[PDB]
């Protein structure tokens, strides 16, 4: 264990090989961590087990910790299995042990462990625990950040938030501590990770951060469920997830595609050209999609302020590819952002506009498609670069 | 070079590193290869070329075999670039060279090369091309097999069947003949390439046919563009096209899905065996998207009476490799098959009913879905036992 602060234990565990999350839906490149705590006053609270592929693990670490029985009190923020993992394994040892979590916490821990005999107290925001030594934990509902279960808990007197989800990322460190990891490889990991899996619930964010900070209490901590705790300086997470929240783009421009024969990819290429020799301020990145990190194109598209999404047509259809990417970003919600489709097409074509569609239902502001037949030759990559100029002021920012 | 058959000689070029044809969306996990023949009786044809990426060594090689003046025709049956590839290295040393091909070759060669100064000569089924000692050459056209361009070249006399593509596959061999290889192999790679690109074309494949052989003309060895020359009983791969034509199922329900947490993995391998334990008869694969051959599951769809496809909620949405596998399944019109949609979800759910829609859409004839939510207990696996149970019965083949 790790000694957050005073009688607060990290009980958690480093997961340095895990690459897949959600299916392969989220690939964390720099591993991750789950973070479960032991707060010991006169009562001792677990806050959050750990994923369930380390279930023998925690419970083995925790009670080199502390005696199982001693135990008072048991908090789940959120039970997805990557924080509640731990939880069958751990109620086989101490099964009358109270639960406290949220109405919706009871139907998916339910749902996940199948134990309704366990005895749950539900909280509700601004419910108390008394653990003794003139502290409390204070309960904070956070439906649908990121699940409908989800909840946070703020210790007072020590003047920690445990987050769970909110404020963390996939980055795996045997530091700690935010102010002891490497600060670009932590933001990275901080913005892929708000990129990837909080962007549909942007609405919801500074709503809940407006309500916490009305409670004017002290934020020393944030120990969030994932990778470090913020001790210096915390707000810092916090004022980027303001940020992040509100329809965030930079002047930013990521055109990504699939092609079967290149033909998409030198229309892409051509329009990067017009657009950079338009514009200069704008950063523009280029993915094949059948080649490139699928997250790392979603952090790019959050990042911007518009793309570019090429296919060609095959068999009457977009590339399934692109057709899966646009379901996704179609679920991810992105808000406030400009799109033109282009492609190229070997006779009647059709996955453009079909394309462009897709990408208006999704809620990008559409602007004209670029359509090219077979290989574009040099006329055809002039009209090509040409719509990357045109594209490049008509999304221009002001000066 | 390796000698066909009298005087025609191959000169094309084996590919035993080739992974990935069009993009990524055809796997070769047994390479390619690329036939070109050369016809040497009073006139010298080229019959088709090879890859692009072999153009260098083709001419050299080809220069090997002849002088590349005292070639007096090309045929080109389709402007694909793994067969028209290497034509602009070759034109740029006979420039004046006539060019065989169909009225929509020179749409998709000039497409490709951008050299309309060419000679092309334009063939319609029926037109013959002499080239002495008593042969000719006869073209059939063949639009979408597979595409508007191409076209088949038979040899008189000789009795050979330039079939381009069709009757083609992607296995890496040395031994050019059908009766040198093994023929499982053989067999694997034969089926793997119908089912994922000439499926959507099957309704103009028993038409076509049937129009060759009421010519009444014989077929002593049909030389593909992909794999294997049919020199030993060569009707195999007719009579095969035309089982797989025909709306083409076995005994047999395949089985995939996406999952996040393994829950909709559990309603997949419940349902198998229910399917197994009420009729013996069929058989049963299972995958999982993100952790397949993408190209398998597709030869095994081809090969099904009926899917059972599985995701579960994401962002309200379906899970992208679903989403993009039933598009591409959308393109391919698989014909007189079944299909039952399943997962799991957290709360208000709705991808399992995306799904079901987009697979009638496709063309699949639905039966009930099955939901579940969160994690499957005791008694909610029962239940995807029983449907395992009862889609087994309503597909049951007769007795
Ligand atoms: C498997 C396959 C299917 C195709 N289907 C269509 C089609 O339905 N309609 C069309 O106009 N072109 C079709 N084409 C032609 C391509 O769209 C054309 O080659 C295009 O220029 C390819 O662009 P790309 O190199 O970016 O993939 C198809 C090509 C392939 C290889
Ligand atoms: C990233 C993510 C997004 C989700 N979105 C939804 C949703 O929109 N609606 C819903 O009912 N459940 C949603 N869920 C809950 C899952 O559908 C639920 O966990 C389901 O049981 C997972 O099935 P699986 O393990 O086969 O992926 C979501 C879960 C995750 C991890
Ligand atoms: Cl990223
Ligand atoms: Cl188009
Ligand atoms: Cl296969
Ligand atoms: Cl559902
Ligand atoms: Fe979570
Ligand atoms: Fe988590
Ligand atoms: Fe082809
Ligand atoms: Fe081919
Ligand atoms: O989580
Ligand atoms: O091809």
């Known amino acids: ?35 479960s705590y032991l707060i010991r006053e006169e009562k001792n609270v677990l806050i959050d087990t750990v994923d369930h592929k380390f279930s023998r693990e925690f419970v083995q670490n925790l009670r080199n910790e ?25 109620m086989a040892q101490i099964p009358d042990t109270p639960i406290y979590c949220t109405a919706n916490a009871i139907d998916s821990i339910n749902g996940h462990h199948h134990h309704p005999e366990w005895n749950f107290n539900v909280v509700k ?51 700690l501590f935010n102010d002891e990891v490497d600060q670009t490889e932590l933001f990275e990991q901080c913005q892929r990770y708000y990129a990837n899996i909080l962007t549909p619930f942007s609405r919801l964010v500074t709503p809940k951060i407006t309500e916490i900070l009305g409670f004017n209490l002290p934020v020393d901590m944030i120990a969030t469920s994932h990778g470090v705790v913020w001790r ?3 707000t810092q997470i916090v004022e980027l997830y303001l940020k992040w929240a509100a329809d965030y783009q930079e002047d930013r421009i990521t055109i990504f595609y699939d092609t079967m024969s290149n033909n998409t ?17 704008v950063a523009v990145k280029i993915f094949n999609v059948a080649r490139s990190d699928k997250n790392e194109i979603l952090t790019n598209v959050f990042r911007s302020k518009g793309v570019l999404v090429g296919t060609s047509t095959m068999n009457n259809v977009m ?6 990417l646009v379901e996704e970003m179609t679920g ?55 719509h990357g100029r045109e594209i490049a002021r008509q999304w221009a920012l002001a000066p």
């Open 319 to 324: 590339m399934p590819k692109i057709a899966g």
């Open 66 to 90: 502390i005696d199982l029985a001693d135990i008072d009190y048991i908090v789940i923020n959120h039970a997805e299995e990557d924080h509640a993992g731990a939880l069958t394994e751990l």
């Open 265 to 281: 990819r030198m229309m892409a290429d051509a329009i990067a050209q017009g657009i950079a020799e338009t514009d200069p301020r």
């Open 232 to 234: 210096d300086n915390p």
């Open 125 to 175: 925001t601004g419910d108390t625990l008394d653990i003794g030594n003139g502290k409390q934990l204070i309960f904070v509902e956070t439906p649908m950040l990121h699940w409908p279960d989800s909840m946070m808990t703020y210790l007072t007197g020590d003047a920690v938030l445990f987050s769970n989800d909110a404020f963390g990322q996939h980055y795996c460190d045997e530091h």
């Open 1 to 35: 264990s790790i000694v957050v602060k005073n009688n607060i234990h990290w009980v958690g565990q480093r997961d340095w090989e895990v690459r897949d999350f959600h299916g392969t839906e989220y690939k964390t490149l720099r591993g991750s961590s789950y973070n």
């Open 332 to 386: 991810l919600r992105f808000r406030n952002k400009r799109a033109s489709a282009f492609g190229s097409h070997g006779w009647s074509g059709g996955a453009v506009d079909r394309l462009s569609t897709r990408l208006q239902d999704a809620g990008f502001e559409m602007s004209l498609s670029l359509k090219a037949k077979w290989r574009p030759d040099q006329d055809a990559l002039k009209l090509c670069r040409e």
